[PDB]
Structures are given as structure tokens and as C-alpha cells.
């Protein structure tokens, strides 16, 4: 079968909103790391709206931080409407999913991993001036052929990128295929039936907020597993680590990744859920899709013994009170093994393998 | 097939949850536009706060709409009766093989856990919050207010529902009512009458307003945005999701119409008795009509090969963007009603994607 995922660059209007939301979070967290933050962003042609709920001692110039963020991405009236120990109960109810699999060394499903890499690549080539006619907004779609339930080839890659008006399509499409697409695709998967569609709907001069309204939390599938796993619904950006929407999904990834790196399974899906004002999850379950070496329920039991899934437990486990979140807000929260991203360390793998037998 | 014991959870929110307010405003505006011009392009986004509604997005139409009156009417209908409104739409005046207007992946799903062919936990979650709305509006529980959330945890054994483990229900309420009386009322009136009798065992846990009082609700107590309840809108986590929000978008957006078609297909597969459950995944490429990929996974429950089912789907359904609109007659102002209590699993006459009107043909084909 053919399976497809997608990603967007840091310049996509929705990601502009996510990154503004998280730039603001990091600024707050730099001064007062215990702050409660629920920062929502809407951005438009002439308009940025910053809303949601904030509790802090920090003093931030929210407008300057939005402008700095838009500047760094590469591109307004501003409306600011904020309303400004381990047994602590969850601040809200909800469900969260974590996932991992052996399709890549980072233990992410292939299609979303390639999709993120394609847009990261175009941003890299923009910012180092190799393709100086590139502009911020970009979109990738990668369709992967599976045979034997394992990746076989890459059927189609679609990449649309914003660009300066001075360049013609023919040369743009050739440049993107040769410089963006081909180098990012693993050679073992590249075969005769590979289709490259670059800028299928033609000229793409106007991009970002100026071309299309963007909102925080509207790329939650691009942020996570690109369609390879179910999702609980919660957005990440703008939320401090006391919000289980973010902390529990991050812990889910940690758990799932450690189960697979432990050798317990070749893939692992974990659902967690919370009730408001209750520390222990209302539910936890692990599904290994028939690939587990020990029963899913025993893995579920091991998860409880080896990870602290209580909200403040997870903060302490992944050391989350750090201004590290603007970096999370483009190119996927999962699958990038940066030092800051504590949820990507397989540092419980050996302990899990040992406990299982 | 494999012996199992596990807990699975879904959630829903009432029509007065701020994100749902935003979704409903977005779709009320879509409805009003379509009333006057059913070929309109609408991508209407809403953000609402304490004393603030922001309406933004892209709209191409001949309709003349009082955007503020529609937002106000919607808020009033939900139960919330200065509220400044900022209208910043990018507005302008303007075959079956036409291409998709954007790329995306969409999933459709159906299973036999409920008569409506939806997975149980999202079903029960929705009905719990509909029940609190009903009891509010007919005055049986007049102290209730619009904002509420439900969450239902189901213990499955051998791949089948066995008992209800936990029900959470948080509801806004008048300051007049005391917490213990609130909780007893919610357990006996809202929760118990909604749960299936045979799934209530001795180990059931009711978590009603666990952190107590809840007087300031809706936009006043938290910000709402369009497209922030997309899991509540679909299958509660029982299926994968491809990304796209529904509300504020006219049927020409494949994010909405292909999701609906997907449900349609998946539901007719199960209704036909071809499978006890069906997941269908479809992908579109910008400017391409016929979709990239169409696959059906019955998870070992299909009475014929998955391949035969996927083949049957292409003979019996038109999955091209404009084909879906004709097949489901999507050019009608029917969307505000979708914007709370789930887009799937409610068998309203307007909801074309919930009709099992091809099941007989699929059954007759496969041999069921």
C-alpha cells in the first residue's frame, strides 16, 4: 500500500502562530520558570492577536517578542488580550498518545520523518544563501510504498515553496528536485517509479500570514506522527509543562521510544489520560500491534514501575522547566535528537529490557 | 483473536466549551453564506475570549452577511445571555474531474460497538455532554450552565467493551448550587441514564467537578479557537487522524469533504456486514482529482479480502473532490449543527455521510 504524510516549514502561517506562542512561553520561562501559560496566537495580513491565560512574575514585551519571532522566521496591528509535591493533580482532563517504531534510527515512522526533513532542508538552503530566492513558507508531502509491512520505495514527493518573483518555475522545480528533494531521500528507497511534483499550483510569491490566516494548534498531526498514530486532540504550543496536553504527550513519546529501543517491541503506542485534580492517570494502555516480546499488559505494568506519569512527576522526569519550546514548534516535536529534547533520550531502555527478561 | 485486557479513553465537550463556541460561530457564518451563495469559498476562523470575538480568514462570495449578528445569535443560542467583535476577513467577490484545492490525508472509521456504528467511548462522551445540555435547556437542571466536558474510560476484554471504568464530568453551574448536590444530580440524572446498563459493574468511578466550583465558564474563563477539538469532532482517538479541522470550511476543502466521505464509506462497509470494523485512508495531491491512495483495513474482521473491499469502494463511491459533494449533497447550510457533539455518529436527516444507503449493494456484491 501507499501511505502519505505532510509537513510545513517554519514559515507556514499556522507555524508562525505556534512559534510566536512558544517564543512567548520561553521568554516567560526564562524569568519565571514556574509560570502558568496558555498562549494562543492568531496571525493575519495586518494583524497579530495574542490571547489566552498567563500567571507569572515575568515582565515581557509581548509585541516585541512576536516581532522578533516573525523576523527570525524571515518575513501589523497587534492585539494583546491575555488574562495575566508530586501528588499535584492534573490541571485539566484529556487523552494523550505516544508512539515509536523501528522504521528510522530516530524510531519515528518514515513518512512524517522525511516530510519534516524536506521542509527543514529548504529552510537550511534559504538561510545559508545557497538558494537565496527561496522564501519562508513551504509544504512537503511524502508518499511511501509499503510491502511486507515495511518501507519499499518512495512513490511521490510533493514540495511547494514560496519564492522571489524574479525566478521562473522551470528552474525553480529543477533546483528543488536536485537540491531539496534528492539529497534528503535515502538512496535505498529511490526507484524508477518516483514522481516529483514541485509547486503543482504554479507561482508562490505571497506566503505566510500575508497570504493566509494562521492559528496556534492547527498543525497537531504535523507536530506529532503525521497520521501513523491516533492523537488525543491537545495542541502543544503556548502551553507550559504543567499542561498535560504537552507534558503527557512528551512522556508518551519517551515511554514509547524507550519500549522500542529496549527491544520489547518493534512498535509501541501508548495512550494516557487524566482527570482534572487527580495526579495518577485515569487510564494507561500500551499497544504493540502484535510485536511485543512480553504481553502488552505486562509492558503497561512495567511502564508504571519505570516512569512517573503524574503531571509534576513528568516535569521532574524530563526536566521541563526550561525555555526550550520555540525550537519544538517547527519541524516536529518528535524525532529530532537534540540535547534539549529530553523526551528523545533512550535512557531507560536497558532498565526496561532488564525488567522484562 | 488475541486475549486482551485494557483501558481506552475518549472525551467530549458541550456546545458551550470555548473551542466549540468558536467552531459553531465559524460554521454559523459558513451556513449563512451558503444560504445566499452555495458555491462560496469559506475558510472562516474564530477566536473568542472574555469580551472579544475575532473573526478572520478567507472568503469568496456574493453573499451579504451581517457577521456580527450571526456570531451574537450563535452565542445566545448556546446559552450565553462589552463583547467587542473584530472582523478581519480577507473578503472578495468571485467538472467532476476538477482537482483537489489542497493536499492532505484523511481517515474514515466505523465499528459495530454502537448501533450508530461508532466506537463506544467517544459515543458515550458525546451523549453525556448532550444530556447535560438537554437537562439545562428544558429546565430539569436549571442551575446548569453551558460549558461542560466529559471523559469516558472503557475497559475492553478480548477486543470488546466489558465495563465502564471511569466517567469524568465537569460542568459549569449557577453559584446557588452546592457541590455535593451538584455531583449527586450529575451522577443520577446525566451519567447513569446514559450508560449502558450491562457495563455498570461495582468498580465504576464517577469524577464530577473534581476541583469543585465552576461558575465562570466558556470564553470568559478561557480562550477558544476554531479547529482545536478535532479528535472530539471525529473518533475520540479510536482511529488515526490526518490533520485538518472541519469548522469554517466549505465542502470544496477536502479536509472536510473527504473526512465525511471516509466516514460514509467506512459506515456502509460495516452496515453491509462486510466487516465488524473498517478504517479507510485517502490521500489527495493538490490539483489532482482522483485521490492518490485509497485503502481499507478491516483489522482481520473482513468477510472478504481487504483488497476486494477497496475495489468495491471505488466501484460504488466517487472520491473525487467534486464527486463527494454530489454524492453527499454537501452544498447546503447544514454545518452549524455539525460543530458540536461530533460530526460522526449522530443520525440527523441532514447528515448524508451517516446514511447506510449503499450497504445493500455492497452486501449483495461481496456475498453477505
**What global shape of chain A is seen?**
flat
The CATH architecture of the largest domain in chain A would be 2-Layer Sandwich
What structural class do helix, strand and pairing data of chain A support?
alpha+beta
Task: Report the sheet-strand fraction of chain A.
Answer: 15-25%
Largest interface: pair, residues per side = A-B, 67 and 63 residues
Which radius of gyration of chain A do the C-alpha atoms yield? 21 Å
Q: Please, how many domains of chain A? A: 3
The level 1 CATH classification of the largest domain in chain A is Alpha Beta
Number of helices of chain A: 8
- The strand order across the widest sheet of chain A is 1-6-7-8
CATH topological fold name of the largest domain in chain A: GMP Synthetase, Chain A, domain 3
Q: Strand count, sense and closure of the main sheet of chain A? A: 4 strands, mixed
Main location (chain A): cytoplasm
GO molecular function (chain A): ATP binding; magnesium ion binding; methionine adenosyltransferase activity
Pfam family, one (chain A): S-AdoMet_synt_M
Binding site for K(+) (chain A): 40
Amino acid at each position: 500500500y501507499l501511505f502519505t504524510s505532510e509537513s510545513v516549514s517554519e514559515g507556514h502561517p499556522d507555524k508562525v502562530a505556534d512559534q510566536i506562542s512558544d517564543a512567548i512561553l520561553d521568554a516567560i520561562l526564562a524569568q519565571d520558570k514556574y509560570s502558568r501559560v496558555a498562549a494562543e496566537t492568531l496571525c493575519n495580513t495586518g494583524l497579530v492577536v495574542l490571547a489566552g491565560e498567563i500567571t507569572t512574575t515575568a515582565n515581557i514585551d509581548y509585541i516585541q517578542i512576536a516581532r522578533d519571532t516573525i523576523k527570525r522566521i524571515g518575513y501589523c496591528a497587534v492585539l494583546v488580550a491575555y488574562d495575566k509535591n508530586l501528588d499535584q493533580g492534573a490541571g485539566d482532563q484529556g487523552l494523550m498518545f505516544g508512539y515509536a517504531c523501528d522504521e528510522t534510527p530516530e524510531l519515528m515512522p518514515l513518512p512524517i520523518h522525511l516530510s519534516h526533513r524536506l521542509v527543514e532542508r529548504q529552510a537550511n538552503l534559504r538561510r545559508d544563501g545557497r538558494l537565496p530566492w527561496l522564501r519562508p513558507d513551504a509544504k512537503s508531502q511524502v508518499t511511501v510504498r509499503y510491502v511486507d509491512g515495511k518501507p519499499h520505495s518512495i512513490d511521490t514527493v510533493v514540495l511547494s515553496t514560496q519564492h522571489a518573483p524574479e525566478i521562473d518555475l522551470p528552474a525553480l522545480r529543477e533546483a528543488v528536485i536536485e537540491e531539496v528533494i534528492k539529497p534528503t531521500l535515502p538512496a535505498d528507497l529511490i526507484k524508477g517509479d518516483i514522481k516529483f511534483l514541485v509547486n503543482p499550483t504554479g507561482r508562490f510569491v505571497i506566503g505566510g500570514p500575508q497570504g493566509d490566516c494562521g492559528l496556534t494548534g492547527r498543525k497537531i498531526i504535523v507536530d506529532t506522527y503525521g497520521g501513523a498514530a491516533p492523537h488525543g486532540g491537545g495542541a502543544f504550543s503556548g502551553k507550559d509543562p504543567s499542561k498535560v496536553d504537552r507534558s503527557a504527550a512528551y512522556a508518551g513519546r519517551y515511554v514509547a521510544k524507550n519500549i522500542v529501543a529496549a527491544g520489547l517491541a518493534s512498535r509501541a503506542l501508548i495512550q494516557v489520560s487524566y482527570a482534572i485534580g487527580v495526579a495518577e492517570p485515569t487510564s494507561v494502555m500500551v499497544n504493540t500491534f502484535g510485536t511485543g516480546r512480553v504481553s502488552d499488559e505486562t509492558i503497561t505494568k512495567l511502564v508504571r514501575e519505570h516512569f512517573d506519569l503524574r503531571p509534576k512527576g513528568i516535569i521532574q522526569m524530563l526536566d521541563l522547566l526550561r525555555p526550550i519550546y520555540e525550537k519544538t514548534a517547527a519541524y516536529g516535536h518528535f524525532g529530532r535528537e537534540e540535547p534539549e529534547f529530553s523526551w528523545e533520550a533512550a535512557d531507560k531502555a536497558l532498565a526496561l529490557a532488564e525488567a522484562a527478561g
